[PDB]
Amino acid sequence: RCVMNRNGVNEASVEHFYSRAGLVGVVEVKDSGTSLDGYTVWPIDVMGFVQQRRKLELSTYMRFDAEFTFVSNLNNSTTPGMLLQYMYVPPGAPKPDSRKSYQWQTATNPSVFAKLSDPPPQVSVPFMSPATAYQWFYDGYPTFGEHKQATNLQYGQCPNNMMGHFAIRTVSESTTGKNIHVRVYMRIKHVRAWVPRPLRSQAYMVKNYPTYSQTITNTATDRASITTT
């Protein structure tokens, strides 16, 4: 019932709190049916899922290197010897727009060639921000000038958080007729966090904005009275 002993202090460290590579994006390289794209571009988003978004927004500033792992397979989970190209498009570089775009040959775009039959390809993306740390909260406007725009977008959107894109394609010459599902797993390494914040209590409405619904949900579940247990 009761544990009279003390646990470990290391399991509560920030480094351990953000460990354990988790799913950050599920992209599909569609190459069949009505979408013969043969490629897909995934903008690196650490906050694609509200769980990881809430965990990250515990801190204001975070600095970390990221290890990305790509678990790719077909719809029937099979992994034939199809050769894939996982091209990392760094921030500021143009992304591909076609299966055979010239951007796939850009040598400055670090590219990983691996077959579906291979173990999941795995790379380390360093800390890519112009600032000294990523900002999950940026109380400001990246533009320059007066900000009386009617729909006040661009507020709170830090431009320094851009980590790049992962353009994935088959190395085919034409459509293969097979859709490939790529699960992108990202591990936070050497994480350092600053300025802890309250954990988000209201449900996330949209991405990139802390907008919450007009119906405020109480942080605590209700009781019958202030004296009941």
Add this chain to the structure above:
Amino acid sequence: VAQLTVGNSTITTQEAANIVLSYGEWPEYCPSTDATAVDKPTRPDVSVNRFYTLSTKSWKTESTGWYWKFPDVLNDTGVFGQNAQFHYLYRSGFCMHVQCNASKFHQGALLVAAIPEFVIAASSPATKPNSQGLYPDFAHTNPGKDGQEFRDPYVLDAGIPLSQALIFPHQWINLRTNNCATIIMPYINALPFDSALNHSNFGLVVIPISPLKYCNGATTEVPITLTIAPLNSEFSGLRQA
């Protein structure tokens, strides 16, 4: 009780200086970086780093609270406002002194917290596709020197619970025991310098947790005075306009 005189400004405050130091860090001048090794940013004296006493907010029974974005709260105020409006880069700490003038027959409690990167959230009735109701207007994100009254103080107008706002550098103003809160916030940013007009490094919230109460005859509104003193302010890239 003493009289702190900084520059030509003098405030009446009590001694013993029960000051909250944000994250145990004193505001310091940034060590000369490569961008600053060539221009030697302007470090103004007590002419700028003086006491700025804003207009007093009237704490009433139904007041939800106020907040001030601090690089913005002094952008149009005196010589600090001049230096902020006409410099490209800016960096400063702040000493914030929130004072209430309440009798011993008034009651209530204020939570005075300094929230770094206090990103204000909009409260939309429903998820509409990228509409105006999804983002706060500039009047709410940068309320200026008049501050902004909280719409939903329970969620800090940011979706985070007010009950956990104490994770930030905070100070209680419980009218029965004290009526002054002093928070010293150093420059906290992912950059050594930044734009004073675009980026608000932090917001200072003054939220009544326990609502103001009084019996008939007492002053129906407790004045809340906010005195601001920039500490170790630096500026770079002077314009003319």
Add this chain to the structure above:
Amino acid sequence: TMVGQICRYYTQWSGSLKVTFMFTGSFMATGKMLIAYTPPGSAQPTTREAAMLGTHIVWDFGLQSSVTLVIPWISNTHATGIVTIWYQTNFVVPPDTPTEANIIALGAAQKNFTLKLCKDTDEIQQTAE
């Protein structure tokens, strides 16, 4: 004032003056006044903020009932500074205590104040005494 009457007996004078303010409200009364001094050559401030931007004293008469404002220099020979008092806060009182009070202003000269060229005053007039 005594200094104001003695200056009438002289032609030139210069030096720093001090002006003390005594709040004479009830002990339970509290609030803040802004004592601002505008140097010579400037019109008196039109708003409390404009006064705050200059030399001023935020006087919390709930804490101290007396405050002293030192005027640095006057030098009226044969413009002048202006002292303004602004309601920084409202006049705060509990129940059953007067909501109106008085401030007593006391003027004097500092030790650097000097007079020059004795001149018969005009404050009195010779008639059929």
